[PDB]
A paper describes a structure:
Here, we present seven nanobodies, derived from llama (Lama glama) immunization, that bind to human C4b (Homo sapiens) with high affinities ranging from 3.2 nM to 14 pM. The activity of the nanobodies varies from no to complete inhibition of the classical pathway. For four nanobodies, we determined single-particle cryo-electron microscopy structures in complex with C4b at 3.4–4 Å resolution. The structures rationalize the observed functional effects of the nanobodies and define their mode of action during complement activation.
Cleavage of the mammalian plasma protein C4 into C4b initiates opsonization, lysis, and clearance of microbes and damaged host cells by the classical and lectin pathways of the complement system. C4b is covalently linked to the targeted surface through a reaction of its reactive thioester moiety with available nucleophiles on the surface. Subsequently, C4b binds protease C2 and forms proconvertase C4b2 that is further processed into C4b2b, which is the (CP and LP) C3 convertase that cleaves C3 (15).
Residue numbers in the entry:
A (entry chain B): 766 to 985, 994 to 1230, 1256 to 1348, 1354 to 1413
B (entry chain A): 20 to 669
C (entry chain C): 1465 to 1594
D (entry chain D): 2 to 120
């Protein structure tokens, strides 16, 4: 019949055949060689130009079809040495009867029913199709290219052929091993765990090896209106100006850190900066020769107001690029006012003790010493990195001497709630030695008072001031451990009252406390869980890295023996490694649930017989 | 009382210019105002985050449009990323004229703005919609700037596994504006849907992702589609239209499939459970690739009775039909499932998303309704009845009824006369008959006693093509203040692309030439000042898709009878030098079991362009601020400001 | 003239809970006879319940599949000598889940179901020839 | 992307002439290579395209089997053997550079080629 070489062979059956990006000078013609597949090719385009822009094109439905075509649909999965049936169907769309001769060529690695190119004849009439079953068993190992040749009769020749590669899966089913494991970087035990190597006896020694590792990571404010209203215009004497300035700076800084300026109009922010600048000038002109900062020039100095001014001005030094050496003189003046044991005298009390806060009482020296130490530490930032070195060294010496005094006084106990709170914060802020830090913190713990859920210490000016100082200490003392969270909540409710923060010292301290707490809670860490895999495989020693800062990750690693794990970071996650290998599995060949058996009785003619 | 107005979109996108509009109000005609505009974050001591701009607006030409460059480096330097309480940046205008002349508290006026790093458009194109494990996946990503012009910024493309696990992350410089990559699916991959995500490296939430399904498939030879007679099945009491459906099996090359179709029916509820029928399976020989099958009323009732479900229970259950066509003598079978038959009382569906709320007393309330046939394209000639009941605060609520027919594009623009005393308007719309589809909404008039109201009236009421100048009629409905001019601006994709003023007259006609800069839709915000307070009323305008101006035309010499191995010349035509990306896919792959997700087409492109739109709703607003908020604008007149958007979405 | 005997049963109690479709494929070279096939359907006791035969392919829709073993047969008309000796095949599908196939093979009356292939523990070869 | 080609010259039919062209300036193993015949009066019909890796190849029906393509990435050289040359094959053959193995753009990157002739 038709010569097998004469008939064209169809072998290129791509699922996608035009994946080029090219430049067109408004007109370009590209020739296409249609793949040997009988389908409809939905050609689509996408033009990108620097002038016009993206412009999708109308798909060009290209239909490729043949009159008398042979269709061969190989099964996706075929095993070796197992009965396989081929059903290439011949389609006859021509307007005449056809006598075809379908035969699979004798390709090595395949086991035809006849064993060779034995022509099989079939009658396919016009406008109809007839399958031609061809039973084979694949004896090869990797793949075999089997072609089908349909030869028409001598009088009416019509040729067609189809070639495909039949990939044979390796012996045995597919087996996947799951090793669920946890990751606790904080844990001091099990950090460098190991994965046992594969030891399943059913594992086929000769086969494809694939391994994979999957790592995951699963993580578990005060009213803007009230604080804004505190941006009062400084005025009055050298003392009354501070009452209107410290809250102005505190609210300005509280909103700054809490990031609440969005709620208020943008004109408010620059209104605040103007008030700070205006308040900065107002208190500057009240400065004495040595930075005393007294209420009146005639009136002698009061270190409390000087210490308070140093604290307030030092904080504002970022907003206003003012003269820092003036403060350096003020800090120097404070040292000259330090008593032998480390306390501070303050010979002249301020006229209006209301703004002093809770200092007034049975004991004032301990609170005053701590208060000055807090301010002095705040003044360390403003000191220029160059120059004034001996003045700085004197500050660390004086503060340490006072710092040592506070611990000695604090350890004695028998001190009021206010004094303990200030000292607790002063000790922590100034980086006191641990021994003195602990005793002061322990004393505060016992004195802590509660009356309900997250209740601690409107409340009177003394209690509100005292709790604020405590909150800073707890935040600085080994972070927040569900005590600052509870204590801060108490302040938020207390500060949300109408006209909250009655006094002035409580306002500046409390606003700093909540701001410090707020920035503490809304703090996000890197949250890394990077791990590395180490093993000594047959090919050698290999390593891997899996950065998981921020999600899950997968990675293919070429390891086939026991492997080592090195967890790191601080985030807890789950690690589970997948190994895939083929196992020796054999089940019934017959059907299990539904069974069909067909038998044939009769006489069938033959042409070539064994 | 001179005033300065500051306009800018409610969201500023990092790395792209921010269009800021400023115009003087009530100037003595004898002085000029100078200054500058910049972006500053107050959390970092008011450190500017953008270079200042030449403010310089004269009294003779009050309106002026400013483009604020917002480089990425400046944003980092002033530390926006260090922000904790969400993204917030302030836009301020610095001009000493505010303090010296207006005697304001300070010489700064600004607006609270949100911001995000989402910038540019990224489109991905996988090699084919579905892969089987072990094959090589090819994909490319197109980087486009905000103006839909090709970009050259560094991008990071990452592939996510079916389980959500990243299996690739390539950070690549893409000067050509097109990046072509290709990886391989693991052979052991379990069936599922993957995802390819890309984003500009500088940005963080500027990502656009495409998905490709992976499963163990073999290319089907023919595709079978169950096309019903009607997309909807009436379930009203008493009347139940026959459920007739058509089955079509066709070889991919187009010739009819001669086989047998085995069909099984069942009810599929919202959750997904199927309640199949027993004995209802109808199998017929496909004649010319067609097999009509229907369920008679009596037998269907018996089947429901067998399941004791009852007709009354067919509220929204979806009739599930699966066909298993076996081509004979071929042998192979392909399954097709129908999941679009909703048992709905109403044959039609009224879409009233285009009617603006916030009716303006004293001006006609234009009611827009889209009469889309249920589960189908918009229909024409469906009468719609509107019964508006205007509420009279001091009299009986008059009942007004108007009837109209669909224009032909599915939309009806029915005006409604409304007196200026109405407290609120209640209207019920019913479309078609019998069993009309009814939709009811209530609109409340803005609070009375305030300043005047502005009413935008569009005589045309048809979708404007690009290059078609559409006219809007502006009318001041409140007190007859002597405001000289009408100020209006056009917002397209959250950008003020045009600002202007039109003098007041007996008739106020404004010509808005619509160009590609306005697509697929834009806003038209116009306002005037009744002495001190502002008055405004926006109007969203849906611009027709039309077509892309690139004009890429794939074409061949017809004759779609190509025998394989033949040379077919493809003609590529474009109006300018451009990068052309070509993909030739097998239609069978769309037949292979999957969700049949559509490719990239201009409908999806314009969705990306409109994805940056900030305004939500058809427009209109009870207060001047609200209309500016809903329009996606950030506005401040010194004495009145606009609250920052609480989220990136409405 | 050759008489088929198609038989189907079902262990049941799990999986199927439904009817089945038979895809019995005739030995290449001939097609099932027409008249003898309808009489399988004409009977009131209608096991086959439907059919569609064309070429060497016969499709049956067994509306019910009992636990026991039943057998329904028909004759076939021949028109061309069978080109070569080989086993044919037939499959049974589940109506509500056609994935649950049941593939089998059947040879000519004087042949064997499976190809002559001697297989060792690890390697197997064919002896298909004269 | 120079594409130097050589090996032409008139040959009696049946001479089995061999044409070879070597390329440079790009990664040869990543790009599909082809041969194109250019008849004096006709257009371009492109004979064969050896796959990126070098295994799959195509041939025009007019040369199927008669001609034979081959490549080797190591030497960046690509060959074509014209067994049993038919006097109608006389033309100028110029190896072509393209992508995706199925379509060649008009003037993406074409060589010079040599005008083979037959007596
Ligand atoms: C960019 O990626 C983010 C990832 O969070 C997408 O946002 C969410 O992503 C999760 C998947 O982790 C989805 O389940 C959510 O639906 C996404 N949206 C929201 C609001 O969480 C974001 O959609 C991506 N950008 C795109 C797709 O343009
Ligand atoms: C093909 O064979 C059928 C057999 O029934 C016959 O009816 C038909 O006429 C034949 N074709 C032509 C063109 O005669
Ligand atoms: C792993 O993570 C930790 C903490 O996130 C980091 O300090 C370390 O540098 C990381 N590993 C490497 C190799 O960088
Ligand atoms: C068939 O059933 C079991 C389960 O697969 C199989 O292992 C065994 O070879 C067969 N046993 C019987 C009794 O048929």
């Amino acid at each position: 019949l038709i010569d097998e070489d004469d008939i064209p062979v169809r072998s290129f059956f791509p699922e996608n055949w035009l994946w080029r990006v090219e430049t067109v000078d408004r007109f370009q013609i590209l020739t296409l060689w249609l793949p040997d597949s009988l389908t409809t090719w939905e050609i689509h385009g996408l033009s990108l130009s620097k002038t016009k822009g993206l412009c999708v094109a109308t798909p060009v439905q290209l239909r490729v079809f043949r009159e008398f075509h042979l269709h061969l649909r190989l099964p996706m999965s075929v095993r070796r040495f197992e009965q396989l049936e081929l059903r290439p169907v011949l389609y006859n769309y021509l307007d005449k009867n056809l006598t075809v001769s379908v035969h699979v060529s004798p390709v090595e690695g395949l086991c035809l029913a006849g064993g060779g190119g034995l022509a099989q004849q079939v009658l396919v009439p016009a406008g109809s199709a007839r399958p031609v079953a061809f039973s084979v068993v694949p004896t090869a190992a990797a793949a075999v290219s089997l072609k089908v040749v349909a030869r028409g009769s001598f009088e009416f020749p019509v040729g067609d052929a189809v070639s495909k590669v039949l990939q044979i899966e390796k012996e045995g089913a597919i087996h996947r091993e799951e090793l669920v494991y946890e990751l606790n970087p904080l844990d001091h035990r099990g950090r460098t765990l190991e994965i046992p190597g594969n030891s399943d006896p059913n594992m086929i020694p000769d086969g494809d090896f694939n391994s994979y590792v999957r790592v995951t990571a699963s993580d578990p404010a005060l009213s803007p209106g009230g604080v804004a209203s505190l941006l009062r215009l400084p005025r009055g004497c050298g003392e009354q100006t501070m009452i209107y300035l410290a809250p102005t700076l505190a609210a300005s800084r509280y909103l700054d850190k809490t990031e609440q300026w969005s709620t208020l109009p943008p004109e408010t922010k620059d209104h605040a900066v103007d008030l700070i600048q205006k308040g900065y000038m107002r208190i500057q002109q009240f400065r004495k020769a040595d930075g005393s900062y007294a209420a009146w020039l005639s009136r002698d100095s009061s270190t409390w107001l000087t210490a308070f001014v140093l604290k307030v001005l030092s904080l504002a030094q970022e907003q206003v690029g003012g003269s820092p050496e003036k403060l350096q003189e003020t800090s120097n003046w404070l040292l000259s006012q330090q008593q032998a044991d480390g306390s501070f005298q303050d010979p002249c009390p301020v006229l209006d003790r209301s703004m002093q806060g809770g200092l007034v009482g049975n004991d004032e020296t301990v609170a005053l010493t701590a208060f000055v130490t807090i301010a002095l530490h705040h003044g360390l930032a403003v000191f220029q990195d160059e120059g004034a070195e001996p003045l700085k060294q004197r500050v660390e010496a004086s503060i340490s001497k006072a710092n040592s005094f506070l611990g000695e006084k604090a350890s004695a106990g028998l001190l009021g709630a206010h004094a303990a709170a200030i000292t607790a914060y002063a000790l922590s802020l100034t980086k006191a030695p641990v021994d003195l830090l602990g005793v002061a913190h322990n004393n505060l713990m016992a004195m802590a008072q509660e009356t309900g859920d997250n209740l601690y210490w409107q409340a009177p000016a003394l209690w509100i001031e005292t709790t604020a100082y405590a909150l800073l200490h707890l935040l600085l003392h080994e972070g927040k451990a569900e005590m600052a969270d509870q204590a801060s909540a108490w302040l938020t409710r207390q500060g949300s009252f109408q006209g909250g923060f009655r006094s002035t010292q409580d306002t500046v301290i409390a606003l700093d406390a909540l701001s410090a707490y707020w920035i503490a809670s809304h703090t996000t860490e890197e949250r890394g869980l990077n791990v590395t895999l180490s093993s000594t495989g047959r090919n050698g020693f290999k390593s891997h890295a899996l950065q998981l800062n921020n999600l899950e990750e997968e990675l293919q690693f070429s390891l086939g023996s026991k492997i080592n794990v090195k967890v790191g970071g601080n985030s807890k996650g789950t690690l589970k490694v997948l190994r895939t290998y083929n196992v020796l599995d054999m089940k019934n060949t017959t059907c299990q649930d539904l069974q069909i058996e067909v038998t044939v009785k009769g006489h069938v003619e033959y042409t070539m017989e064994a | 009382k001179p005033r300065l107005l500051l306009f800018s979109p409610s969201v500023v996108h990092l790395g792209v210019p921010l269009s800021v509009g400023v115009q003087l109000q009530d100037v003595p005609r004898g002085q000029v105002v100078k200054g500058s505009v910049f972006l500053r974050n107050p959390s970092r001591n008011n450190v500017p985050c953008s270079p200042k701009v030449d403010f310089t607006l004269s009294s003779e030409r009050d309106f002026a449009l400013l483009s604020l460059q917002v480089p990425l480096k400046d944003a980092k330097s002033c530390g926006l990323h260090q922000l904790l309480r969400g993204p917030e940046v302030q836009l301020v205008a610095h001009s000493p004229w505010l303090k010296d002349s207006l005697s304001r508290t300070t010489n700064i006026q600004g607006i609270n703005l949100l911001f995000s790093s989402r910038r540019g458009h990224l489109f991905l194109q996988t090699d084919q919609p579905i892969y089987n494990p072990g094959q090589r996946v090819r994909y490319r990503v197109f980087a486009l700037d905000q103006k839909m012009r090709p970009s050259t910024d560094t991008i990071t493309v990452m592939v996510e596994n079916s389980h959500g696990l990243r299996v690739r992350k390539k950070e690549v410089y893409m000067p050509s504006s097109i990046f072509q990559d290709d990886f391989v699916i693991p052979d052991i991959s379990e069936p599922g849907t993957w995802k390819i995500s890309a984003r500009f490296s500088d940005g963080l939430e500027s990502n656009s992702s495409t998905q490709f399904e992976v499963k163990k498939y073999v290319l089907p030879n023919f595709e079978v589609k169950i096309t019903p007679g009607k997309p909807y099945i009436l379930t009203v009491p008493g009347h139940l239209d026959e459920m007739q459906l058509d089955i079509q099996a066709r070889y991919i090359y187009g010739k009819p499939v001669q086989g047998v179709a085995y069909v099984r029916f069942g009810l599929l509820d919202e959750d997904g459970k199927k309640t199949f029928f027993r004995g209802l399976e109808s199998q017929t020989k496909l004649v010319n690739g067609q097999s009509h099958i229907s369920l008679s009323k009596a037998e269907f009732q018996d089947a429901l009775e067998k399941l004791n479900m009852g007709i009354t229970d067919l509220q929204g259950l979806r009739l599930y039909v699966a066909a298993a066509i076996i081509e004979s003598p071929g042998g192979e079978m392909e399954e097709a499932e129908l999941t679009s038959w909703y048992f709905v009382s109403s044959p039609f569906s009224l879409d009233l998303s285009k009617t603006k709320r916030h009716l303006v007393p004293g001006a006609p309330f234009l009611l827009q309704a889209l009469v889309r046939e249920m589960s189908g394209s918009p229909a024409s000639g469906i009468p719609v009845k509107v019964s508006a009941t205007v509420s009279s605060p001091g009299s009986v609520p008059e009942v007004q009824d108007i009837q109209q027919n669909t224009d032909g594009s599915g939309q009806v623009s029915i005006p409604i006369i409304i007196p200026q005393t109405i407290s609120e308007l209640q209207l019920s719309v019913s479309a078609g008959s019998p069993h009309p589809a009814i939709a009811r909404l209530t609109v409340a008039a803005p609070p009375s006693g305030g300043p005047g109201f502005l009413s935008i009236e569009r005589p045309d009421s048809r979708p404007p093509r690009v290059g078609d100048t559409l006219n809007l009629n502006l009318r001041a409905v409140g007190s007859g203040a002597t405001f000289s001019h009408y100020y209006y601006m056009i917002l397209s994709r959250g950008q003020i692309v045009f600002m202007n003023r039109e003098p007041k007259r007996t008739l106020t006609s404004v010509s808005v030439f619509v160009d590609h800069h306005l697509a697929p839709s834009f806003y038209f915000v116009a306002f005037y000042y009744h002495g001190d307070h502002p008055v405004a009323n926006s109007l969203r305008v849906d611009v027709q898709a039309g077509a892309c101006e690139g004009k890429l035309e794939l074409s061949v010499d017809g004759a779609k009878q190509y025998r394989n191995g033949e040379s077919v010349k493809l003609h590529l035509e474009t109006d300018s030098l451009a990068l052309v990306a070509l993909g030739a896919l097998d239609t069978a792959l769309y037949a292979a079991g999957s969700k049949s997700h559509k490719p990239l087409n201009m409908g999806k492109v314009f969705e990306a362009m409109n994805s940056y739109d900030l305004g939500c709703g058809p427009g209109g607003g009870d207060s001047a601020l609200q209309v500016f908020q809903a329009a996606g604008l950030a506005f401040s007149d010194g004495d009145q400001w606009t609250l920052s958007r609480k989220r990136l979405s409405c | 003239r050759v008489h088929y005997t198609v038989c189907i049963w079902r262990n049941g109690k799990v999986g199927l809970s439904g009817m089945a479709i038979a895809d019995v494929t005739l030995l290449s070279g001939f097609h099932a006879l027409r008249a003898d096939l309808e009489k399988l359907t004409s009977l009131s006791d209608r096991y086959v319940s439907h059919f569609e035969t064309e070429g060497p392919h016969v499709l049956l829709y067994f509306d019910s599949v009992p636990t026991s073993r039943e057998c329904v047969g028909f004759e076939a008309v021949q028109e061309v000598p069978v080109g070569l000796v080989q086993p044919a095949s037939a499959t049974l599908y589940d109506y509500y889940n056609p994935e649950r196939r049941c593939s089998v093979f059947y040879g000519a009356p004087s042949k064997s179901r499976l190809l002559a292939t001697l297989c060792s523990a690890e390697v197997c070869q064919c002896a298909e020839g004269k | 992307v120079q594409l130097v080609e050589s090996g032409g010259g008139l040959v009696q039919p049946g001479g089995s002439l061999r044409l070879s062209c070597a390329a440079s300036g790009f990664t040869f193993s990543s790009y599909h290579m082809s041969w194109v015949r250019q008849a004096p009066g006709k257009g371009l019909e492109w004979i064969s395209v050896i796959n990126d890796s070098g295994d799959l190849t195509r041939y025009a029906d007019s040369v199927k089997g008669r001609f034979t393509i081959s490549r080797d990435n190591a030497k960046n050289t690509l060959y074509l053997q014209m067994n049993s040359l038919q006097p109608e094959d006389t033309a100028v053959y110029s190896c072509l550079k393209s992508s995706d193995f199925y379509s060649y753009s008009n003037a993406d990157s074409r060589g010079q080629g040599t005008q083979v002739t037959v007596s």
